[PDB]
Amino acid sequence: MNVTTPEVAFREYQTNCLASYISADPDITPSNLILQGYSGTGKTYTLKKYFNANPNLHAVWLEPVELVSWKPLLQAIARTVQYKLKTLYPNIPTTDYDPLQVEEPFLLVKTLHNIFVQYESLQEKTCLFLILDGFDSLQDLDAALFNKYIKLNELLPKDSKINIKFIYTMLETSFLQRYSTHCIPTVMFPRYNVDEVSTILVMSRCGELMEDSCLRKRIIEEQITDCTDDQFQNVAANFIHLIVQAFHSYTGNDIFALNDLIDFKWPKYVSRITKENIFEPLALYKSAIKLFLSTDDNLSQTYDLSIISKYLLIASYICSYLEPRYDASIFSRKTRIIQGRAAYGRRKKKEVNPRYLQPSLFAIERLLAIFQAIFPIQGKAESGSLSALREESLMKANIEVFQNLSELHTLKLIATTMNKNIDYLSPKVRWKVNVPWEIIKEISESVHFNISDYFSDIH
Amino acid sequence: PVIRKFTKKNVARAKKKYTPFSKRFKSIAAIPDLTSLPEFYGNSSELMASRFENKLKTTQKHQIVETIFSKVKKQLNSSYYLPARENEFASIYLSAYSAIESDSATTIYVAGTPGVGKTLTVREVVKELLSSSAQREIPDFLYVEINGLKMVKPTDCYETLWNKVSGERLTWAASMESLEFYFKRVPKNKKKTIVVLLDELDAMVTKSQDIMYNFFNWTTYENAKLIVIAVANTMDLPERQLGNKITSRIGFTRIMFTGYTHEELKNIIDLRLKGLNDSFFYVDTKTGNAILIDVRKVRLRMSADAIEIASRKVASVSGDARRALKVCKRAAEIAEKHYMAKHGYGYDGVQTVHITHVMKALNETLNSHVITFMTRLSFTAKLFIYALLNLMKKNGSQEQELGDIVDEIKLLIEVNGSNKFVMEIAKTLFQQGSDNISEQLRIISWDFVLNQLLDAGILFKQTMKNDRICCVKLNISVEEAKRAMNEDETLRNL
Amino acid sequence: NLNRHIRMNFETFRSLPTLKNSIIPLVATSKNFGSLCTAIKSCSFLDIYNKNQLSNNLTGRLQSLSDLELAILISAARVALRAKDGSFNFNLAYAEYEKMIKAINS
Numbered sequence A: 001m002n003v004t005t006p007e008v009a010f011r012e013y014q015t016n017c018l019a020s021y022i023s024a025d026p027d028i029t030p031s032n033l034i035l036q037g038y039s040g041t042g043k044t045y046t047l048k049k050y051f052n053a054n055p056n057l058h059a060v061w062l063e064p065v066e067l068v069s070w071k072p073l074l075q076a077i078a079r080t081v082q083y084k085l086k087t088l089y090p091n092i093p094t095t096d097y098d099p100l101q102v103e104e105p106f107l108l109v110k111t112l113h114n115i116f117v118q119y120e121s122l123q124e125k126t127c128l129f130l131i132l133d134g135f136d137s138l139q140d141l142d143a144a145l146f147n148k149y150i151k152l153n154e155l156l157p158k159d160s161k162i163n164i165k166f167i168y169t170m171l172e173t174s175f176l177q178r179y180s181t182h183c184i185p186t187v188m189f190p191r192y193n194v195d196e197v198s199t200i201l202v203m204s205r206c207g208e209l210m211e212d213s214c215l216r217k218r219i220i221e222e223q224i225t226d227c228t229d230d231q232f233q234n235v236a237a238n239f240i241h242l243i244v245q246a247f248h249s250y251t252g253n254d255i256f257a258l259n260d261l262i263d264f265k266w267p268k269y270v271s272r273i274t275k276e277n278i279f280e281p282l283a284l285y286k287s288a289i290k291l292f293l294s295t296d297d298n299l300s301q302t303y304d305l306s307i308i309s310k311y312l313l314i315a316s317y318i319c320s321y322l323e324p325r326y327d328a329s330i331f332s333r334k335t336r337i338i339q340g341r342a343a344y345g346r347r348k349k350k351e352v353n354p355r356y357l358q359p360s361l362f363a364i365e366r367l368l369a370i371f372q373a374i375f376p377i378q379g380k381a382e383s384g385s386l387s388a389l390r391e392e393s394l395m396k397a398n399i400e401v402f403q404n405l406s407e408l409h410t411l412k413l414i415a416t417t418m419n420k421n422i423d424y425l426s427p428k429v430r431w432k433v434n435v436p437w438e439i440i441k442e443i444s445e446s447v448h449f450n451i452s453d454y455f456s457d458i459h
Numbered sequence B: 001p002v003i004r005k006f007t008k009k010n011v012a013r014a015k016k017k018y019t020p021f022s023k024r025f026k027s028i029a030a031i032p033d034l035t036s037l038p039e040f041y042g043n044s045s046e047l048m049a050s051r052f053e054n055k056l057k058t059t060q061k062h063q064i065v066e067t068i069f070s071k072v073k074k075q076l077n078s079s080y081y082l083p084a085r086e087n088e089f090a091s092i093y094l095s096a097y098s099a100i101e102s103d104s105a106t107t108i109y110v111a112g113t114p115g116v117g118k119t120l121t122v123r124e125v126v127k128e129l130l131s132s133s134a135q136r137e138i139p140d141f142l143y144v145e146i147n148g149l150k151m152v153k154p155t156d157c158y159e160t161l162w163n164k165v166s167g168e169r170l171t172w173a174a175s176m177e178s179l180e181f182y183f184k185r186v187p188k189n190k191k192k193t194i195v196v197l198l199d200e201l202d203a204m205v206t207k208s209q210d211i212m213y214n215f216f217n218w219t220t221y222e223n224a225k226l227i228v229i230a231v232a233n234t235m236d237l238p239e240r241q242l243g244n245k246i247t248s249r250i251g252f253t254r255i256m257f258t259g260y261t262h263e264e265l266k267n268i269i270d271l272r273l274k275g276l277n278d279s280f281f282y283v284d285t286k287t288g289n290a291i292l293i294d295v296r297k298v299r300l301r302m303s304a305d306a307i308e309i310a311s312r313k314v315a316s317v318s319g320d321a322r323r324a325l326k327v328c329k330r331a332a333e334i335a336e337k338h339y340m341a342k343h344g345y346g347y348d349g350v351q352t353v354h355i356t357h358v359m360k361a362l363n364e365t366l367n368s369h370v371i372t373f374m375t376r377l378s379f380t381a382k383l384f385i386y387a388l389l390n391l392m393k394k395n396g397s398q399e400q401e402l403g404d405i406v407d408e409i410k411l412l413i414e415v416n417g418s419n420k421f422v423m424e425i426a427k428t429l430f431q432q433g434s435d436n437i438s439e440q441l442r443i444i445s446w447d448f449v450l451n452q453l454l455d456a457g458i459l460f461k462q463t464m465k466n467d468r469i470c471c472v473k474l475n476i477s478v479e480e481a482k483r484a485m486n487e488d489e490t491l492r493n494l
Numbered sequence C: 001n002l003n004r005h006i007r008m009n010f011e012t013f014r015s016l017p018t019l020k021n022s023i024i025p026l027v028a029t030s031k032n033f034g035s036l037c038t039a040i041k042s043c044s045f046l047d048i049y050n051k052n053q054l055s056n057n058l059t060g061r062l063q064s065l066s067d068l069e070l071a072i073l074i075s076a077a078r079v080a081l082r083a084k085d086g087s088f089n090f091n092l093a094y095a096e097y098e099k100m101i102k103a104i105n106s
């Protein structure tokens, strides 16, 4: 059958494969076939490109990326099949069944059989195509699904004036190798390379970012009447060359992240281009090298909280990365009175820097003690005859610390043994924290506290 | 305006009542006689029994072909006198006759292995009891078949009991209550004796035996008359599910049927064959049809020594007449098809079967095709099982991971860099000979054979994600694994 | 070559339908008699078929990646070999990676 080939730039192998696989007559098409690939390769884009190349053939489209289970696919398919049938055969009579009536593949095949028997008076046999984009991307997927969908053409009677076909698309290929014994035809799209992705981008996003507003914005913000579409395309092309030369090591052969980053960082580069910068783009790149050297694509201060919240979270990081016995030397300030000896501390240096380690457990009284020790100074005294006689200048176990600590657990910064039916009160509960080193570091200099010396000496 | 949070439209509600019989007369003096009632005691099920007879009738005939053995197969079939098991007949029929004479509520329980003819003997006993009912001297009573396996829900016993003793439809919770009412609150003068047969109780009451508890509660009345029997396989059930106190208070009688002896088996199977045993037939010259007392007059026979051996081998294990009869039928089938192949008639003066062929039919049941298949596989599976056995010999672990077995495989291959078989299967397995193909850590087809052996059952895989540390087990044996190993000329020497 | 592939089916899989799948594309893409004859003679397009069939299973995916991936994978692998169960984390691999770069620049 005459099939117009889509003259694609990079997927002509799969184009040939599928153009040979599929045509109008169902006799020369396989019973079941798969079209697997990886994200960014435009497998879905090329499917519709081939459909554009072949208008007479038609197919239904479903996106189970949004659907969650099997029955939603059942209802969607039951709706779409008859919707397409009646839309593409206006003159045919019908008794439209309820698509919601389906709740099981048995019911689905029953209603399709009803559809076919009411469509028994067709002039020639016709096979349609079905599409399930991301069938492995389901959210409650199990391993007993694909074979059942493969088994649709069997239970169908062979005298059907209207038949159907299946299409698929996977990402991992692990579940694909989990089921390959049935010898299914398959076409694959390998992940692209440097020049392939570069050309793909400079022919896909070229127009999109050429007809963007920011170009015209800058062209009259600079007010320079020396331009042409050729030079616009050249400057965009070399800027994309710079983008890829900078961030190929970061990602490699992907398009989605590159497009997102381009959308984020294009305006800053456009805000810098000028006459001298277009006449000599190396200096322009030197002037916009900062985003290339640092993406910094997120968002002085970091908090607007109280003081004890800031200062108590500081203690917990210490109480799970420091040995319980190697702390009495540095965390004591009283003057001894009665006879007694201290320890020798850490005789042996550690070479692992427990920053790299999963933290330990502890009881809360440890936190109480260490926080009492490290708390800043308050309750100013005067050295008077009675000033310090009763002041007791040191924070004690009030209620506010209890409440702000209880707040932290709902803030999910202090982590306890994960439990449904949690119980903050128990003798046996262990506690921990979920914060990296940077979270704790950001507090230190902001509040003018210093604990880096406790960690910087061991390793 | 309102939206139903979840819909149920495929539901198939059953049109059955909730009101028990106890609330349509409202007084003890307001109840009529159920005996003088046309709807009660099942006088309407006949129309339903006969209504579906014509749904599958046709009259297509074209060149009918009939042969010698099929009539003997039918004569030997299970769809039909027996003196072998008769003492139990004389005992249980005597007990039932005395029970119906006494008009009491007697209980009896029986069991047996499948194939002891328990159902056959009980059916014949109740048929002779039907004949005694045709004596018109004993009080009439009605049978009740109970097949919970053919039933879906175990509580539907009450539903069907009511729908067959009255034709009325209800749900279990009302039918069983109305039946309690019909049993203990109803006097004797008009109620009818009923006999009931329970079958294969081992799966009816899996949950808590509440249903059979209710039954055995019914079977403990003096104003109500019933004849209750049950069938099972195990023997401890009455005291296991109920306990000791209930089973002792009821005080029933216990019995079980054991496998028959070889002599009785042969006597019975030949009893189902005396009509055709050593018969002479007029046989046509084209179709070979055997007609009984261009045509011969030949004789038919079968190996009595084969009867002896076939009954002897199977009487010592279970005593399953079904097994014996199917063995005889398949021996007849093989003989018949071999004879047909001798001439080759197509499709549109002595005849006898031999000990050789009777044993041929009898022994292939125990001869397992697994050995031949597993010896007839490719080299890969045999090599991998041999490596598993090598690890078993090395560590005595009874278990092996995937990484360790793959390590053993690579060691076993690379150690034998000299053997000719491994030499000649060397390079066509990783990258398939030619260039332009990069090496792969694993061989080709390893996952294929792995899933093949998983689907075969010899391999057991635990639920894990890691492709390496996933534990693996073999299912059959190491000895049979050798009995597959050493028959490969290359494996024996390595 | 076709008899060699017959041998290959005989010794690898021992099942016909996979071979049916492999042969279908040849005639499927066949256009004219001369190309048919030459392609079934040299069977060089079976080379492309079996090259692109299992291309992206274990090797090609590792062939297409950045050197940072290789460096961090080496950092993880060495510490796993040093370890008992081979367990590893983000910052352990980072530490070994920085040690690698320090030695390289030293």
Ligand SMILES: Nc1ncnc2c1ncn2[C@@H]1O[C@H](COP(=O)(O)OP(=O)(O)OP(=O)(O)O)[C@@H](O)[C@H]1O
Pocket: A008, A009, A010, A011, A038, A039, A040, A041, A042, A043, A044, A045, A134, A169, A171, A200, A204, A255
């Ligand atoms: N040969 C090509 N020609 C033109 N555009 C291409 C080509 N290959 C890939 N692309 C681009 O790649 C983009 C990939 O996005 P697409 O929505 O098709 O995802 P995908 O690769 O199918 O992944 P997933 O199914 O996981 O979403 C397509 O929008 C298309 O613009």
Ligand SMILES: Nc1ncnc2c1ncn2[C@@H]1O[C@H](COP(=O)(O)OP(=O)(O)OP(=O)(O)O)[C@@H](O)[C@H]1O
Pocket: B077, B078, B079, B080, B081, B082, B084, B085, B113, B114, B115, B116, B117, B118, B119, B120, B121, B200, B268, B320, B321, B322
């Ligand atoms: N004495 C006998 N006379 C005739 N046939 C017999 C005799 N003993 C056993 N059989 C045959 O053996 C078959 C075994 O059937 P049986 O009554 O034992 O079934 P069952 O134990 O109720 O079955 P299941 O366990 O499958 O429910 C009988 O149908 C009958 O064909």
Ligand SMILES: [Mg+2]
Pocket: A039, A040, A042, A043, A044
């Ligand atoms: Mg996509």
Ligand SMILES: [Mg+2]
Pocket: B119, B199
């Ligand atoms: Mg039975």
